[PDB]
Design an enzyme around this catalytic site. Structure first.
Site, mmCIF file in Angstrom:
data_model
loop_
_atom_site.group_PDB
_atom_site.id
_atom_site.type_symbol
_atom_site.label_atom_id
_atom_site.label_comp_id
_atom_site.label_asym_id
_atom_site.label_seq_id
_atom_site.Cartn_x
_atom_site.Cartn_y
_atom_site.Cartn_z
ATOM 1 N N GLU A 193 2.159 -8.721 14.260
ATOM 2 C CA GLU A 193 0.485 -8.873 15.367
ATOM 3 C C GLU A 193 1.009 -10.263 16.149
ATOM 4 O OE1 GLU A 193 -2.799 -8.603 14.424
ATOM 5 O OE2 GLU A 193 -3.806 -9.068 16.550
ATOM 6 N N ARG A 213 0.500 -1.063 -0.140
ATOM 7 C CA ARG A 213 0.115 0.225 0.097
ATOM 8 C C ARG A 213 1.155 1.407 -0.282
ATOM 9 N NH1 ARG A 213 -4.314 -3.453 3.044
ATOM 10 N NH2 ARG A 213 -2.594 -2.875 4.866
HETATM 11 N N1 AMP Z 1 -5.931 -0.313 8.555
HETATM 12 C C1 AMP Z 1 -5.961 -0.164 9.840
HETATM 13 N N2 AMP Z 1 -7.451 0.443 10.464
HETATM 14 C C2 AMP Z 1 -7.279 -0.708 11.916
HETATM 15 N N3 AMP Z 1 -6.583 -0.773 13.118
HETATM 16 C C3 AMP Z 1 -5.136 -1.276 12.162
HETATM 17 C C4 AMP Z 1 -4.488 -1.304 10.393
HETATM 18 N N4 AMP Z 1 -3.821 -1.368 10.252
HETATM 19 C C5 AMP Z 1 -3.209 -2.288 11.091
HETATM 20 N N5 AMP Z 1 -4.183 -1.749 12.276
HETATM 21 C C6 AMP Z 1 -3.844 -2.446 13.382
HETATM 22 O O1 AMP Z 1 -2.722 -1.610 14.091
HETATM 23 C C7 AMP Z 1 -1.984 -3.128 14.801
HETATM 24 C C8 AMP Z 1 -0.962 -3.370 14.410
HETATM 25 O O2 AMP Z 1 0.079 -2.340 14.036
HETATM 26 P P1 AMP Z 1 0.675 -2.965 12.958
HETATM 27 O O3 AMP Z 1 1.812 -4.108 13.217
HETATM 28 O O4 AMP Z 1 2.214 -1.932 12.647
HETATM 29 O O5 AMP Z 1 0.646 -2.747 11.301
HETATM 30 C C9 AMP Z 1 -3.422 -3.997 14.718
HETATM 31 O O6 AMP Z 1 -3.103 -3.388 16.175
HETATM 32 C C10 AMP Z 1 -4.601 -3.451 13.871
HETATM 33 O O7 AMP Z 1 -5.430 -4.224 14.177
HETATM 34 CL CL CL Z 2 0.349 -3.905 1.908
#
Ligand code: AMP
Ligand code: CL
Ligand code: AMP
Ligand code: CL
Ligand code: CL
Ligand code: CL
Ligand code: NA
Ligand code: NA
Lengths: 182, 183
Positions: free
Chosen positions: A102, A65
């Site tokens: 995660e 993205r």
């Molecule tokens: N597009 C999104 N909308 C909402 N929450 C997101 C999104 N992308 C990542 N997260 C949340 O952010 C965390 C993941 O962090 P990351 O590993 O930085 O993508 C989890 O709590 C996900 O559910």
């Molecule tokens: Cl992506």
């Protein structure tokens, strides 16, 4: 700089999906913004305007993205675009950085010849959540002798503390759409 | 309306080739060396936008992930929406999917059902045309939603794999900037 009418148009252009990918998650979907040529163009023009005078020599965008925002920003700034990619996808010599997911960890790679001393880099990605991928990307750029002090995002999930995490690595974040929730 | 010899030379010389990636006997054509060169990258986008400025395109579809790097700037140049076609489990809203054959297995692509409407005229963009398998599946996703697609654009055409002919037989006219031989 940007008007209420503009920021509200961009915030309203992004769909939020309850219970994706699992119950109790409100997913911020940037694909509705991409589909709207007014929202997509406004978002690229605003990021470019922020950096027109920063002396950027290169834009780095995160797979996949982040490509959709970093590559148009490179073209608007009149500079080269460099992708950071999931492992095994770049064909020439790379270096790698590991970051938390995660669930477990993953790697980002960069071509070793893409950044050199005297480059000033902007990192662009769709969304700032933990900032794990951006910390990894900053480490790739610095290992190649590039300078980076700037990261730009469409969305900032400000409850997740990514911005203060990046400030501690010397990165200033610019984001168009703040959203609450985690 | 087409690249000059000087422009074709400059674009072809901007692309690095890697023997035996991603397997032995393939000569990989790498667009990252073109992306990092602002002159080459801007030229490539200018030539694709020029070709479709009068074609009445309403949506651009770009295939994940290298296609995003050419389809998104073309969408912006044409003033039209961009729709990603992605690997499975990345798109968060209602999707449909297509399964297609690669050398050593099968691959899957998805599109948002709401992203293409009957009456949409769609341009598909990818970095490189090889057998045409990928674009063929993408075209099926678009046509299954009632979109009309007659056009695909590429940076590179591997003319030995006859993708162009495979696509013209499906009502898809290819426009590619850089022809290379080999697989
Ligand atoms: N597009 C999104 N909308 C909402 N929450 C997101 C999104 N992308 C990542 N997260 C949340 O952010 C965390 C993941 O962090 P990351 O590993 O930085 O993508 C989890 O709590 C996900 O559910
Ligand atoms: Cl992506
Ligand atoms: N020699 C090559 N160099 C770089 N990319 C390639 C090469 N051969 C195939 N591809 C890519 O592999 C995928 C399969 O192409 P196709 O056979 O058109 O479905 C597409 O993403 C092509 O862009
Ligand atoms: Cl490494
Ligand atoms: Cl890819
Ligand atoms: Cl050759
Ligand atoms: Na939660
Ligand atoms: Na003209």
């Amino acid at each position: 700089t940007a008007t209420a009418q503009q920021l509200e148009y961009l915030k309203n252009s992004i769909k939020s999906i309850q219970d994706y990918p699992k119950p109790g998650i409100l997913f911020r979907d940037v694909t509705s913004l991409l589909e709207d040529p007014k929202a997509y163009a406004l978002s690229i023009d605003l990021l470019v305007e922020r950096y027109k005078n920063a002396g950027i020599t290169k834009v780095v965008g995160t797979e996949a993205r982040g490509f959709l925002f970093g590559a148009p920003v490179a073209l608007g700034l009149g500079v080269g675009f460099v992708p950071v990619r999931k492992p095994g996808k770049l064909p020439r010599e790379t270096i790698s950085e590991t970051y938390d997911l995660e669930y477990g960890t993953d790697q980002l790679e960069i071509h070793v010849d893409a950044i050199k001393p005297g480059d000033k880099v902007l990192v662009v990605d769709d969304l700032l959540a933990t900032g794990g991928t951006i910390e990894a990307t900053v480490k790739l750029i610095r290992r190649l002798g590039g300078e980076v002090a700037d990261a730009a995002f469409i969305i900032n999930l400000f409850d997740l503390g990514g911005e203060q995490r990046l400030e501690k690595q010397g990165i200033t974040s610019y984001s168009l759409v703040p959203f609450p929730g985690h």
